[PDB]
Amino acid sequence: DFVLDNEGNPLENGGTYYILSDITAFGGIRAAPTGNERCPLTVVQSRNELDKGIGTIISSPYRIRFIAEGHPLSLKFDSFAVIMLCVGIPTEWSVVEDLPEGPAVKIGENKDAMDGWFRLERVSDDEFNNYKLVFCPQKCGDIGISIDHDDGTRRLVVSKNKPLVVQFQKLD
Amino acid sequence: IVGGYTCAANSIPYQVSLNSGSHFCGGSLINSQWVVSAAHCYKSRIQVRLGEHNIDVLEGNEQFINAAKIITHPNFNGNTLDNDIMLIKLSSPATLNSRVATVSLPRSCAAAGTECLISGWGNTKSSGSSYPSLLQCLKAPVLSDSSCKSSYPGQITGNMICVGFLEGGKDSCQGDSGGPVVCNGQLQGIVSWGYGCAQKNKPGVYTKVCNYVNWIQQTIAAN
Ligand SMILES: [Ca+2]
């Protein structure tokens, strides 16, 4: 079936949605600098119950009009303000294979860019429109959270142990 | 469709619309009761609208009919996108007339450079999204395999053709899948995929119907 935004409406293939989390404790997805990066290159998760993070432009090579779960997806942050040292960095979500905390989700140009597609999958015990992203390199692996130890940042990563239940909200 | 132009009224009579809450794909009527389209458009409940021009207004020439059978090709691969083709059986044969005709199945495969007509109510903007009321038309030639493969290395199967411009500008998009690519009064392609739309060095990838005449013709005869 088609993936529903929080307003029970399906996600438009190529639209822009906020990727909120189920637990109100945290917030939305956004790029932030981490470890040794002068540019905000780590797709992170806010901890503020009020920051809806950055807008993502979900999309599939498949020309259908809405996003159906099980279809290959390509996630991309909408243009967001950065420093002069970063204006021009690519915005597409990627997965750099082999990093301490496991395959991390990073934006910008990254050498060890693993080939594959994202895919959404419903989880919710038939209540809200709760989904989870998975990565299937070209079987699949969920996308959970690996807390930055020496910092605290909720870095996005593929973790079997735990996935990341998220819910979208149209931008406009 | 992006870069095309608004089709005239009932210019393409055989074109349909897969509706399930709202337009999400298209198709093409081949005989009074069946509808061929992209297999990735499969959905449990489908309403095949016909005789449509402006899909937002009831012009009183359309026929809304539910699908009864929706058979996706046996060897269709959701992963590799190969064999993106399905047949939909109208639960009541349409009334073939002026505003509702049927496109002919291909007698042979389309040669490179053969010009074609693509239509759909899919997105009109390269960046952003503008969904039309009226059906859109596009004139694009069927690119050579030697060329197609180059643009999508490792992804082109024996069943996919490329049709468009390596220069960008005119292409199909979200909301056109399942639709026709009609060449010389013969159905020679079904919208299936691409990377973005009208992007440079990325033409659209279309299912090669000509590799399905025997399947189609058997399935309909069998069901
Ligand atoms: Ca109409």
Side-chain angles (χ1 to χ4, degrees), chain A residues 119-123 126 128-137:
Chain A
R119 290 203 307 91
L120 285 149
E121 284 198 60
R122 177 164 177 71
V123 284
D126 210 350
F128 317 127
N129 298 330
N130 297 354
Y131 295 87
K132 68 166 177 185
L133 295 76
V134 309
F135 187 72
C136 309

Side-chain angles (χ1 to χ4, degrees), chain B residues 1-98 100-106 108-223:
Chain B
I1 292 301
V2 171
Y5 62 98
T6 319
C7 311
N10 324 335
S11 291
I12 39 273
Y14 52 62
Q15 156 94 211
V16 321
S17 163
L18 291 169
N19 183 284
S20 179
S22 29
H23 176 88
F24 77 86
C25 279
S28 198
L29 196 74
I30 22 182
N31 80 72
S32 76
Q33 301 208 91
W34 293 79
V35 166
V36 63
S37 160
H40 80 250
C41 289
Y42 177 102
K43 208 155 154 56
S44 78
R45 299 179 176 79
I46 286 186
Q47 175 177 79
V48 176
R49 324 252 260 221
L50 298 93
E52 298 284 16
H53 198 34
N54 163 334
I55 69 183
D56 304 76
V57 176
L58 282 167
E59 303 173 286
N61 198 359
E62 316 90 347
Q63 304 176 51
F64 298 0
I65 311 170
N66 296 261
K69 290 192 169 297
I70 10 91
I71 321 162
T72 56
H73 187 286
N75 320 111
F76 169 66
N77 188 350
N79 301 160
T80 76
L81 333 149
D82 188 24
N83 284 172
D84 210 4
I85 192 166
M86 72 175 175
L87 291 152
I88 296 178
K89 201 199 182 72
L90 291 193
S91 80
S92 291
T95 289
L96 283 41
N97 63 216
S98 45
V100 186
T102 59
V103 59
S104 215
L105 286 183
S108 62
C109 301
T114 303
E115 205 129 43
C116 310
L117 184 55
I118 318 171
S119 52
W121 285 277
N123 192 354
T124 33
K125 287 185 59 191
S126 327
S127 291
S129 33
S130 173
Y131 282 113
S133 266
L134 281 290
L135 182 60
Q136 288 306 293
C137 278
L138 180 63
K139 309 294 192 63
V142 36
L143 307 183
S144 48
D145 173 55
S146 313
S147 257
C148 185
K149 302 263 186 74
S150 296
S151 305
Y152 298 94
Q155 304 160 342
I156 302 331
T157 45
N159 317 310
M160 315 161 150
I161 41 173
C162 274
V163 173
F165 315 107
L166 304 149
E167 325 83 83
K170 320 190 210 302
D171 183 32
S172 1
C173 219
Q174 292 63 232
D176 288 354
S177 291
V181 149
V182 195
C183 312
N184 263 240
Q186 296 197 20
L187 181 65
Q188 297 279 194
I190 289 178
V191 191
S192 185
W193 68 279
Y195 285 119
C197 297
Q199 286 299 61
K200 199 178 178 190
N201 222 352
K202 293 294 183 180
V205 199
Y206 304 82
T207 307
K208 192 164 63 178
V209 181
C210 70
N211 287 346
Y212 297 106
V213 183
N214 233 124
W215 183 67
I216 292 167
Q217 294 184 139
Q218 263 227 323
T219 295
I220 298 195
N223 286 268

